[PDB]
């Protein structure tokens, strides 16, 4: 059983947020489960939005009902969420989830989708530039070498970084993005490797920016 | 009622 | 309508320590109360359902108890992989969550490994130069990173970023980026970051000469 959100990274103020969760491994028409949406503004607590049942029965967060539309599509095994008249307060990560696990009505949420960050802003989407942080004599300590990738000038958040298509996870530090004076974000991802491996092992950072639907695979070579 | 009703479990 | 009062808002403890979190419901909700664990960037994960039942695969150091309005969540021996934010959640009436508790770890002093990165040739071709100074796996979080350009202290042209606590050794990492235009970058020779930290006897400086 896997859930996956899909929606627009950016939504202009006053316009309608629209997301879709696709479910594989279980039928959403199965009378045994419910299907809900939860959101989480950055640095704030989880907030449940609404729950939908195959019959059409719905539960709503009373603070959001007048702006919320939750629907189900039996054909595509998907269910949707629409939030009208968004403001900055609606900028949040939105999760889909399965509920009604034991009770005949919503109880707890398991499992969850990975979550989709929706940013409310009038600015335009911009993909990132990716530049290597090359290992050198100034990037060693004691058999250890540091290298990385600079992911600069993108909007909106987020950007995900992997190393060697996920094969390299030990010693990787991907830093939180910082908002630059230009209104664009920038971050760096680094990894410490043995200096023995610099001449032998290939190092590639895989930068994904789903809001702009762009990727960069940057090979990081020694200086 | 002040002490809650029992929610139904799936059979 | 039913509010969950989660307390404390945040806490710090050392490895092996006992950690306790409480949630109080504004109305009686029987045992219709669950607990979740959420790591940064990750979706929350169910740990305990119906106040006291441990979900499959959850370590037995996590436990919960309570009924009616008073509920308790306990980590009997805090581990570095337990550094996360925890949430209660009732389903007595609709769904509401507690305010959350982010759990941090206190540990021994650890000095950073410092590395400096000159701007790429690719970025220089685009008209901008970013110099990156890296502080790797240190504790505590507090650190002073000072950029010196031709031994002149810099201010207002750098930005810092600190990772979340490492799930293995509970240390922090810090990145500080000095951003100049390509024109201004070529008017100076020596680029240095000087790091001051509790784990270092004296400040550590990593530097390079532009084009050398």
Numbering used by the authors:
A (entry chain A): 2 to 35, 35A, 35B, 36 to 82, 82A, 82B, 82C, 83 to 100, ...
B (entry chain P): 2 to 12
C (entry chain B): 1 to 94, 96 to 213
From the paper:
Additional electron density for the bound peptide (slightly longer) was observed in the MAD2-6 IgG Fab structure, which includes Gln12 from region I, allowing detection of additional hydrogen bonds between Fab B and the peptide termini. The difference in the number of hydrogen bonds to the overlapping epitope (from K4-K11) between IgG and IgA Fabs is likely due to the higher resolution of the IgG Fab structure. Additionally, since the two copies of either MAD2-6 IgA or IgG Fabs come into close contact while simultaneously binding the peptide, they display homotypic Fab-Fab interactions, which were first observed in anti-NANP antibodies. Thus, MAD2-6 exhibits an inherent propensity for homotypic Fab-Fab interactions that are further strengthened by heavy-chain somatic hypermutation, potentially explaining its low affinity in vitro and increased avidity in vivo. Although both MAD2-6 IgA and IgG Fabs exhibit identical epitope conformations, peptide interactions and homotypic contacts, some differences are observed in their constant domains. Although the kinetics of MAD2-6 IgG were comparable to deglycosylated MAD2-6 IgA, IgG treatment showed no protective efficacy in vivo. The KxxK motif bound by MAD2-6 is strikingly similar to heparin/heparan sulfate consensus binding motifs and we confirmed that MAD2-6 and heparin compete for binding to the P17 peptide.
We identified an IgA mAb, MAD2-6, that bound to a conserved epitope on the N-terminus of PfCSP, inhibited sporozoite invasion in vitro and reduced liver parasite burden in vivo. Crystal structures of this antibody revealed a unique mode of binding whereby two Fabs simultaneously bound either side of the target peptide. Interestingly, antibody MAD2-6 bound to a peptide P17 that covers region I (KLKQP), which is a conserved functional site in the N-terminus of PfCSP associated with cleavage prior to hepatocyte invasion. The epitope targeted by MAD2-6 contains part of the epitope targeted by 5D5 as well as up to four residues from the region I KLKQP sequence.
